Amino acid sequence: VAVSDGVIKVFNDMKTPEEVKKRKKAVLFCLSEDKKNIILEEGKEILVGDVGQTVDDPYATFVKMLPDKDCRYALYDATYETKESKKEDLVFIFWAPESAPLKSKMIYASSKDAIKKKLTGIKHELQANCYEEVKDRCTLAEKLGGSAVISLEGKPL
């Protein structure tokens, strides 16, 4: 499975006021129709300029874009705080719900290493196989900075 140019560009962009509004906050990736390429999933993104305009809780909106019965990769640009610092980091997410079909799920699972190698410098990964896990802010917070993280995406934990 190849990784498309678009995925390469979007990651590197995520690594003027109008230009800042076009930066991605979250983006979803999926298999192409022939299942030979990992591509940007059209329209399944949140922009920085969306937040405060049409998006009030970007992580909750991100979760609403995950398919119930298919797998996805995603990048989410997460803000979080410890007692002493405020941080922002990209998180690579692998979404693999149990009811997704096994055949394409195994393509996603076996291709994850190859796409992550393109995301050079990625420091954090969250894998989830159900909504309870992907919505667990404590779990995302721990993938980001462990037990020292006390707030995430602008809300106390």
């Binding site: 693999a96 096994l102 055949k103 799920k105 195994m106 699972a109 076996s110 196989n129």
Partner: protein, 114 residues
């Protein structure tokens, strides 16, 4: 709490058979998608077999089709990999994982002598 304990590996003559086991604890194997992958030193992981949760639909890599069978025993909370017609190219550490979960056990070494 979660454990994935592989066993059953060993040194086998090419053309021989081996059955690997993964004894799991902390979760029910029939509620997760369980998969076997293998890793040779200096090489990328190769996913070889998987069995879906609840149902028992299976998936096999082309490299092991017709030679390997994956199964599980719900009551023993164990997943198996039956291997036949082993080849030197099958030499690797074999791991049994939950798809969509980070944690991995220590694996079991399989060595096939030509």
């Amino acid at each position: 709490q979660v454990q994935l304990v592989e066993s059953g590996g060993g040194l086998v003559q090419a053309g021989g058979s081996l059955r690997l086991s993964c004894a799991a604890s902390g979760f029910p194997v029939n509620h997760r998608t369980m998969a076997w992958y293998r890793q040779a030193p200096g090489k990328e992981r190769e996913w070889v077999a998987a069995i879906e949760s609840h149902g028992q639909e299976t998936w096999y890599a082309d490299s092991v089709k017709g030679r390997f069978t994956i199964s599980r025993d719900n009551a023993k909370n164990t997943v198996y990999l039956q291997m036949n017609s082993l080849k030197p190219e099958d030499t690797a550490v074999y791991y049994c994982v939950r798809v969509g979960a980070e944690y991995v056990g220590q694996g079991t070494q399989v060595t096939v002598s030509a």
